[PDB]
């Protein structure tokens, strides 16, 4: 665990801990960005400063990080087939998805759903 820039990203390392966070979020009118990553994935690692900066800017959005090997059950539930995959959730439903290290597409999709 080390930091080179500010961040508001929360990593979940157990399926139970994710499921409880997800259940609490189901009832909230709040956007969640789920970053499905792998420790070995180059583009994931390149995006980390970009996502950290995004999470420090869009402080009204919840940013979550899930490893697809550690939580393979969660990744398979959402059909993740390549990394990084950013899943945008609101009130328990997927509203957008980004597949790949695509900063501008992600930012556009967040702004579309960050407010009512």
Coordinates of N, CA and C in Angstrom, one line a residue:
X1 N 0.8 -1.2 0.0 CA 0.0 0.0 0.0 C 0.8 1.3 0.0
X2 N 0.8 2.0 -1.1 CA 1.5 3.3 -1.2 C 0.7 4.2 -2.0
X3 N 0.9 5.5 -1.9 CA 0.2 6.6 -2.6 C 1.2 7.5 -3.2
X4 N 0.9 7.9 -4.5 CA 1.7 9.0 -5.1 C 0.8 10.2 -5.4
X5 N -0.5 10.1 -5.3 CA -1.4 11.2 -5.5 C -2.7 10.9 -4.7
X6 N -3.4 12.0 -4.4 CA -4.7 11.8 -3.7 C -5.7 10.8 -4.4
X7 N -6.5 10.2 -3.6 CA -7.4 9.2 -4.2 C -8.6 9.0 -3.2
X8 N -9.8 8.7 -3.7 CA -10.9 8.3 -2.9 C -11.4 6.9 -3.3
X9 N -10.5 6.1 -3.9 CA -10.9 4.7 -4.4 C -10.8 3.8 -3.2
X10 N -11.9 2.9 -3.0 CA -11.9 1.9 -2.0 C -11.8 0.5 -2.8
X11 N -10.8 -0.3 -2.3 CA -10.7 -1.6 -2.8 C -11.3 -2.6 -1.9
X12 N -12.0 -3.6 -2.5 CA -12.7 -4.7 -1.8 C -12.0 -6.0 -2.1
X13 N -11.6 -6.7 -1.1 CA -10.8 -7.9 -1.2 C -11.6 -9.2 -0.8
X14 N -12.9 -9.0 -0.5 CA -13.7 -10.2 -0.3 C -15.1 -10.0 -0.9
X15 N -15.7 -11.0 -1.4 CA -17.0 -11.0 -2.1 C -18.0 -10.5 -1.1
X16 N -18.0 -11.0 0.2 CA -19.0 -10.6 1.2 C -18.9 -9.1 1.4
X17 N -17.7 -8.5 1.5 CA -17.6 -7.1 1.8 C -18.1 -6.3 0.6
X18 N -17.9 -6.7 -0.6 CA -18.5 -6.1 -1.8 C -20.0 -6.2 -1.7
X19 N -20.5 -7.4 -1.5 CA -22.0 -7.5 -1.5 C -22.7 -6.7 -0.5
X20 N -22.1 -6.5 0.7 CA -22.7 -5.6 1.7 C -22.6 -4.1 1.2
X21 N -21.5 -3.7 0.7 CA -21.4 -2.4 0.1 C -22.4 -2.2 -1.0
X22 N -22.6 -3.2 -1.9 CA -23.5 -3.1 -3.0 C -25.0 -3.0 -2.5
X23 N -25.3 -3.8 -1.5 CA -26.7 -3.8 -1.0 C -27.0 -2.4 -0.3
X24 N -26.1 -1.8 0.4 CA -26.3 -0.5 0.9 C -26.5 0.6 -0.2
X25 N -25.7 0.4 -1.3 CA -25.8 1.3 -2.4 C -27.1 1.2 -3.2
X26 N -27.7 0.0 -3.1 CA -29.0 -0.2 -3.9 C -30.0 0.8 -3.7
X27 N -30.1 1.3 -2.4 CA -31.1 2.2 -2.0 C -30.7 3.7 -2.1
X28 N -29.5 4.0 -2.5 CA -29.0 5.3 -2.6 C -29.0 5.9 -4.0
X29 N -29.5 7.1 -4.2 CA -29.5 7.8 -5.5 C -28.1 8.4 -5.7
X30 N -27.1 7.5 -5.9 CA -25.7 7.8 -5.9 C -25.0 7.0 -7.0
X31 N -24.2 7.6 -7.8 CA -23.4 6.9 -8.8 C -22.3 6.1 -8.2
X32 N -22.1 4.9 -8.7 CA -20.9 4.1 -8.2 C -20.2 3.7 -9.5
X33 N -18.8 3.9 -9.5 CA -17.9 3.5 -10.5 C -17.2 2.3 -10.0
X34 N -17.3 1.1 -10.7 CA -16.6 -0.1 -10.3 C -15.6 -0.4 -11.3
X35 N -14.3 -0.3 -10.9 CA -13.1 -0.6 -11.7 C -12.7 -2.1 -11.5
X36 N -13.0 -2.9 -12.5 CA -12.6 -4.3 -12.5 C -11.2 -4.4 -13.1
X37 N -10.2 -4.8 -12.3 CA -8.8 -4.7 -12.6 C -8.2 -6.1 -12.4
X38 N -6.9 -6.2 -12.9 CA -6.1 -7.4 -12.6 C -4.7 -6.9 -12.2
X39 N -4.1 -7.6 -11.3 CA -2.7 -7.2 -10.8 C -1.7 -7.2 -12.0
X40 N -1.9 -8.1 -12.9 CA -1.0 -8.3 -14.0 C -1.2 -7.4 -15.2
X41 N -2.3 -6.7 -15.2 CA -2.8 -6.0 -16.4 C -2.2 -4.6 -16.6
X42 N -1.4 -4.4 -17.6 CA -0.7 -3.2 -17.9 C -1.6 -2.0 -18.0
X43 N -2.6 -2.0 -18.8 CA -3.5 -0.8 -19.0 C -4.1 -0.5 -17.7
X44 N -4.5 -1.5 -16.8 CA -5.0 -1.2 -15.5 C -4.0 -0.3 -14.7
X45 N -2.8 -0.7 -14.7 CA -1.8 0.0 -13.9 C -1.6 1.4 -14.5
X46 N -1.6 1.6 -15.8 CA -1.5 2.9 -16.4 C -2.7 3.8 -16.0
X47 N -3.8 3.2 -15.8 CA -5.0 4.1 -15.5 C -5.1 4.5 -14.1
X48 N -4.3 3.8 -13.2 CA -4.5 4.1 -11.8 C -4.3 5.6 -11.4
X49 N -3.3 6.3 -11.9 CA -3.3 7.7 -11.5 C -4.4 8.5 -12.1
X50 N -5.0 8.1 -13.2 CA -6.1 8.8 -13.9 C -7.4 8.6 -13.1
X51 N -7.6 7.3 -12.7 CA -8.8 7.0 -11.8 C -8.6 7.7 -10.4
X52 N -7.4 7.7 -9.8 CA -7.3 8.3 -8.5 C -7.6 9.8 -8.6
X53 N -7.1 10.5 -9.6 CA -7.4 11.9 -9.8 C -8.9 12.1 -10.1
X54 N -9.5 11.2 -10.9 CA -10.9 11.3 -11.1 C -11.7 11.2 -9.8
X55 N -11.3 10.3 -8.9 CA -12.0 10.0 -7.7 C -11.9 11.2 -6.7
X56 N -10.8 11.9 -6.8 CA -10.6 13.1 -6.0 C -11.3 14.3 -6.5
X57 N -11.7 14.3 -7.8 CA -12.5 15.4 -8.4 C -14.0 15.1 -8.3
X58 N -14.5 14.0 -8.7 CA -15.9 13.6 -8.6 C -16.2 13.0 -7.2
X59 N -16.1 13.9 -6.2 CA -16.3 13.5 -4.8 C -17.7 13.1 -4.5
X60 N -18.7 13.4 -5.4 CA -20.0 12.9 -5.2 C -20.3 11.6 -5.8
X61 N -19.2 10.9 -6.3 CA -19.3 9.6 -7.0 C -18.5 8.6 -6.1
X62 N -19.0 7.4 -5.9 CA -18.3 6.4 -5.2 C -17.4 5.6 -6.2
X63 N -16.1 5.5 -6.0 CA -15.2 4.7 -6.8 C -14.7 3.5 -6.0
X64 N -14.9 2.3 -6.7 CA -14.6 1.0 -6.1 C -13.7 0.3 -7.0
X65 N -12.8 -0.5 -6.4 CA -11.8 -1.3 -7.2 C -11.9 -2.8 -6.8
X66 N -12.1 -3.6 -7.8 CA -12.3 -5.1 -7.6 C -11.3 -5.8 -8.5
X67 N -10.6 -6.7 -7.9 CA -9.6 -7.6 -8.7 C -10.4 -8.8 -9.2
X68 N -10.2 -9.0 -10.5 CA -11.0 -10.1 -11.2 C -10.6 -11.5 -10.9
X69 N -9.3 -11.7 -10.3 CA -8.9 -13.0 -9.9 C -9.4 -13.2 -8.4
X70 N -9.2 -12.2 -7.6 CA -9.6 -12.3 -6.2 C -11.1 -12.5 -6.1
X71 N -11.9 -11.7 -6.8 CA -13.3 -11.7 -6.8 C -13.8 -12.2 -8.1
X72 N -13.4 -13.4 -8.6 CA -13.8 -13.9 -9.9 C -15.3 -14.1 -9.9
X73 N -15.9 -14.4 -8.8 CA -17.4 -14.6 -8.8 C -18.1 -13.2 -9.2
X74 N -17.6 -12.1 -8.6 CA -18.2 -10.8 -8.9 C -18.0 -10.5 -10.4
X75 N -16.7 -10.7 -10.9 CA -16.4 -10.4 -12.3 C -17.3 -11.2 -13.2
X76 N -17.5 -12.5 -12.9 CA -18.3 -13.3 -13.8 C -19.8 -12.9 -13.7
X77 N -20.3 -12.4 -12.6 CA -21.7 -12.0 -12.4 C -21.9 -10.8 -13.4
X78 N -21.0 -9.9 -13.5 CA -21.2 -8.7 -14.4 C -20.6 -8.9 -15.8
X79 N -20.2 -10.2 -16.1 CA -19.7 -10.5 -17.5 C -18.5 -9.8 -17.9
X80 N -17.5 -9.5 -17.0 CA -16.3 -8.8 -17.3 C -15.4 -9.8 -18.2
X81 N -15.0 -9.3 -19.4 CA -14.2 -10.1 -20.3 C -12.9 -9.6 -20.6
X82 N -12.5 -8.3 -20.2 CA -11.3 -7.7 -20.5 C -11.1 -6.6 -19.4
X83 N -9.9 -6.2 -19.2 CA -9.6 -5.2 -18.1 C -8.8 -4.1 -18.6
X84 N -9.0 -2.9 -18.1 CA -10.0 -2.6 -17.0 C -11.4 -2.5 -17.6
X85 N -12.4 -2.9 -16.9 CA -13.8 -2.6 -17.2 C -14.3 -1.7 -16.1
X86 N -14.9 -0.6 -16.5 CA -15.5 0.3 -15.6 C -17.0 0.2 -15.7
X87 N -17.7 -0.2 -14.6 CA -19.1 -0.4 -14.6 C -19.7 0.7 -13.8
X88 N -20.7 1.4 -14.4 CA -21.3 2.5 -13.7 C -22.7 2.0 -13.2
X89 N -22.9 2.1 -11.9 CA -24.1 1.6 -11.3 C -24.9 2.7 -10.6
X90 N -26.2 2.7 -10.7 CA -27.0 3.6 -9.9 C -28.2 2.9 -9.4
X91 N -28.6 3.1 -8.1 CA -29.7 2.4 -7.5 C -29.7 0.9 -7.9
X92 N -28.6 0.3 -7.9 CA -28.4 -1.1 -8.1 C -28.4 -1.6 -9.5
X93 N -28.5 -0.7 -10.5 CA -28.6 -1.1 -11.9 C -27.5 -0.5 -12.7
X94 N -26.9 -1.2 -13.6 CA -25.9 -0.7 -14.5 C -26.5 0.3 -15.5
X95 N -25.9 1.5 -15.5 CA -26.3 2.5 -16.4 C -25.4 2.8 -17.6
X96 N -24.1 2.5 -17.4 CA -23.1 2.6 -18.5 C -22.0 1.6 -18.3
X97 N -21.2 1.3 -19.3 CA -20.0 0.5 -19.2 C -18.9 1.0 -20.1
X98 N -17.6 1.0 -19.6 CA -16.5 1.3 -20.4 C -15.5 0.1 -20.3
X99 N -15.1 -0.4 -21.5 CA -14.1 -1.5 -21.6 C -12.8 -1.0 -22.1
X100 N -11.8 -0.9 -21.3 CA -10.5 -0.5 -21.7 C -10.1 0.8 -21.1
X101 N -8.8 1.2 -21.2 CA -8.2 2.4 -20.6 C -8.6 3.6 -21.4
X102 N -9.9 4.0 -21.3 CA -10.4 5.1 -22.1 C -10.9 6.2 -21.2
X103 N -10.0 7.2 -20.9 CA -10.3 8.2 -19.9 C -11.4 9.1 -20.3
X104 N -11.5 9.6 -21.6 CA -12.5 10.5 -21.9 C -13.9 9.9 -22.0
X105 N -14.0 8.7 -22.5 CA -15.2 8.0 -22.5 C -15.8 7.8 -21.1
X106 N -14.9 7.4 -20.2 CA -15.3 7.2 -18.8 C -15.8 8.5 -18.2
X107 N -15.1 9.6 -18.4 CA -15.5 10.9 -17.8 C -16.8 11.4 -18.4
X108 N -17.0 11.2 -19.7 CA -18.3 11.5 -20.3 C -19.4 10.8 -19.7
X109 N -19.3 9.4 -19.5 CA -20.3 8.6 -18.9 C -20.6 8.9 -17.5
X110 N -19.6 9.3 -16.7 CA -19.8 9.7 -15.3 C -20.7 11.0 -15.2
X111 N -20.3 12.0 -16.0 CA -21.0 13.3 -16.0 C -22.5 13.1 -16.4
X112 N -22.8 12.1 -17.2 CA -24.1 11.8 -17.6 C -25.0 11.3 -16.5
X113 N -24.5 10.8 -15.4 CA -25.2 10.2 -14.4 C -24.9 10.6 -13.0
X114 N -24.0 11.6 -12.8 CA -23.6 12.0 -11.5 C -24.7 12.7 -10.8
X115 N -25.6 13.3 -11.5 CA -26.7 14.1 -10.9 C -28.0 13.5 -11.4
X116 N -29.1 13.9 -10.7 CA -30.4 13.5 -11.0 C -30.9 13.9 -12.4

